[PDB]
Design a protein around this ligand. Structure first.
Ligand SMILES: *[C@@H]1O[C@H](CO)[C@@H](O)[C@H](O)[C@H]1NC(C)=O
Ligand SMILES: *[C@@H]1O[C@H](CO)[C@@H](O)[C@H](O)[C@H]1NC(C)=O
Ligand SMILES: *[C@@H]1O[C@H](CO)[C@@H](O)[C@H](O)[C@H]1NC(C)=O
Ligand SMILES: *[C@@H]1O[C@H](CO)[C@@H](O)[C@H](O)[C@H]1NC(C)=O
Ligand SMILES: *[C@@H]1O[C@H](CO)[C@@H](O)[C@H](O)[C@H]1NC(C)=O
Ligand code: NA
Ligand code: NA
Lengths: 206, 218, 160
């Protein structure tokens, strides 16, 4: 069980970047997390801003959804943000995390490539579907698998975006099945969501 | 002026037990909840549990059972044990503070250094390499380096001759602790069924050097 | 001090007075003084450590309705809801007290269960014979949760 945040938020340098946090019945605080270093609170009690935190960091809350607003966004803001809430059952619950990114390069639509299990692997009594996403910016996607026409989440492994030499990013997602599962459906599908567009590839056994 | 840091190993083999200790320097253990938290992709930041100076412990429901936090008031240290670990436990663990009182508004203070424990696979294994046959007229084919350990793996096409269009991806960390990756080339569609394409896979840690020819569908 | 209720204390002669260093702020403890006391008897028959605390519902169920009315006079057009302690240790969360050679810890959740708008409540406790303490509640320790939630349902919790 988690509070719900969007995976990514992207704005041009020096603009308003807003992050939501839905599913919090009580007060909410926020944590900024940069690679390697430790998380640090930027806002607490919905809109309180502690010392050391610039006055461009603010936020508010309306019943259900808490918000973290960021005006004049610069390079020193790029980091993963996590909202937190107290609970009477699990004590503490965090959001799914949002990745703030300042556009330092034009956007690029991801190139998806889906491969069916090879005859070779099936001989080995194993079946793997390979979804390959390359050349996309900013580096943040959502991989969603579908069997026939219904969603499937079990057996899916997905990497985190890795910056390539081209300054862009690339990821991959593998749906591992048993030859039986694979052949008992007529079409598996891999849908990748990036920004406001989604590419969907579909393969089928023969 | 309170400092927290986590000692303990950075490697705990699968199905074993993770043991960490957070040392508190410059301050008493009284009037505080000494907590543990971990952070990783696929699971995000999640609270593990905290402990009072009397030993009163409150663990997270999700990890309730195989989790145990203790505290030695003497050495100003509190420990953490996580039994029957798996690949899903591989994450960056932290030790933080919480001021005794109303937790409705509380937020963790005095964050630790950022200890990263990795639950490694069981032993060394070579990869099984499988071909990914191909079907605005271009085409894409590739290789599948499956179930291997440890890193890294180097893939190349046509003995290094083929470069433009090639893209090898980062490895996936299987639940079983093993690794897998894929290399793919975008080749002119008319080149199919004529220009031979071969992927050269090498995994030195197991002396595995497979060269698999990836030819079109049957 | 880390309690919730005031046993054998002083009574506000006139009516109900609200006292705090900063009512506009949430961090500061709220201490409301009452006039009429409420009987709270915690007996220990004898698990053996499990006890109880008989408190007439109506008395308590009314000494929060009027308490809201006074709070509403400090918060315009805002509802007043009461909810249990959000603590991490037994000593602060529960109503703890030294009763005839024994420290108690009463799960006082039932005392603060929902909003109050204008039988006997039994509270389980922690720690061989029959002990009985006969105190009377003269005042309450509360703590408001700030944040400007737009439902404007000011949630209050017994603490400090
Ligand atoms: C009390 O808190 C308010 C903000 O709610 C603040 O403006 C005021 O200065 C505080 N009073 C004192 C005495 O510090
Ligand atoms: C209060 O009583 C409830 C009964 O369900 C129990 O679950 C809860 O843990 C108790 N609170 C404390 C901290 O004593
Ligand atoms: C909440 O109130 C209901 C009556 O409306 C009562 O039956 C129940 O016991 C209360 N829950 C708690 C927290 O004890
Ligand atoms: C007392 O008032 C409260 C207000 O929440 C109500 O929920 C409860 O049922 C009432 N009970 C009695 C016996 O008056
Ligand atoms: C409060 O006073 C009563 C007598 O009215 C006494 O019996 C009781 O022990 C006192 N309460 C406590 C917990 O000290
Ligand atoms: Na780290
Ligand atoms: Na999370």
């Amino acid at each position: 069980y988690e509070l719900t945040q969007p995976p990514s938020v992207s704005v041009s340098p020096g603009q308003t970047a807003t992050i939501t946090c839905s599913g919090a019945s009580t007060n909410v605080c926020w944590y900024q997390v940069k690679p390697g270093q430790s998380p640090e609170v930027v806002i607490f009690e919905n809109y309180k801003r502690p010392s050391g935190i610039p006055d461009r960091f603010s936020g508010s809350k309306s019943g259900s959804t808490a918000t973290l607003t960021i005006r004049g966004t610069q390079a020193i803001d790029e980091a993963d943000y996590y909202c937190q809430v107290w609970d009477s059952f699990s004590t503490f619950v965090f959001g799914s995390g949002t990745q703030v990114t300042v556009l330092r390069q034009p956007k690029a639509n991801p190139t998806v490539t889906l491969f069916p299990p090879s005859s070779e692997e099936l001989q080995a009594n194993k079946a793997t579907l390979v979804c390959l996403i390359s050349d996309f910016y900013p580096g943040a996607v959502t991989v969603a698998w579908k069997a026939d026409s219904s969603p499937v989440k079990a057996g899916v492994e997905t990497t985190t975006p890795s910056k390539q030499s081209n300054n862009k990013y690339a990821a991959s997602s593998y749906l591992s099945l048993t030859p039986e599962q694979w052949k008992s459906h007529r079409s598996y599908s891999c849908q990748v969501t990036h920004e406001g567009s989604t590419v969907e590839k579909t393969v089928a056994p023969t | 002026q309170v400092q927290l840091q986590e000692s303990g190993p950075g490697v705990v083999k699968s199905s074993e037990t993770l043991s960490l200790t957070c040392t508190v320097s410059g301050g008493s253990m009284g009037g505080t909840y000494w907590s543990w938290l971990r952070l990783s992709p696929g699971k995000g930041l999640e609270w593990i549990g905290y402990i009072f100076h009397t030993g009163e412990t409150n663990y997270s429901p999700s990890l309730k059972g195989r989790v145990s936090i203790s505290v030695d008031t003497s050495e100003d240290q509190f420990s953490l044990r996580l039994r029957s670990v798996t690949a899903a436990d591989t994450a960056v663990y932290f030790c933080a503070s919480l001021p005794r009182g109303q937790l409705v508004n509380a937020y963790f203070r005095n964050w630790g250094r950022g200890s990263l424990v990795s639950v490694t696979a069981a032993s060394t294994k070579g990869p099984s390499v499988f071909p990914l046959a191909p079907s605005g007229g271009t085409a894409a084919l590739g290789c599948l380096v499956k179930d291997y350990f440890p890193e890294p793996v180097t893939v190349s096409w046509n003995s290094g001759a083929l470069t433009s269009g090639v893209h090898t991806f980062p490895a996936v960390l299987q639940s079983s602790g093993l690794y897998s990756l894929s290399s793919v080339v975008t080749v002119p569609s008319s080149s199919l069924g004529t220009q031979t394409y071969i992927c050269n896979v090498n995994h030195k840690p197991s002396n595995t050097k497979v060269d698999k020819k990836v030819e079109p569908k049957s | 001090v880390s309690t919730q209720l005031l046993l054998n204390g002083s009574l506000a002669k006139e009516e109900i007075v609200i006292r705090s260093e900063n009512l506009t702020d949430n961090a500061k403890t709220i201490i409301v003084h009452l006039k009429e006391s409420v009987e709270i008897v915690c007996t220990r028959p004898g698990d053996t450590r499990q006890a109880h605390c008989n408190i007439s519902e109506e008395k308590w169920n009314k000494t929060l309705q009027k308490v809201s009315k006074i709070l509403q006079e400090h918060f315009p057009n805002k509802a007043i809801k009461f909810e249990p302690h959000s603590g991490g240790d037994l000593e602060i969360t529960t109503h703890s007290f030294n009763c005839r050679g024994e420290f108690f810890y009463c799960n006082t959740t039932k005392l603060f269960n929902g909003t109050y708008n204008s039988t006997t409540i039994t509270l389980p406790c922690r720690i061989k014979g029959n002990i009985t303490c006969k105190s009377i509640i003269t005042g309450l320790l509360l703590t408001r949760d700030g944040g400007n939630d737009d439902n404007d349902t000011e949630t209050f919790r017994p603490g400090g």
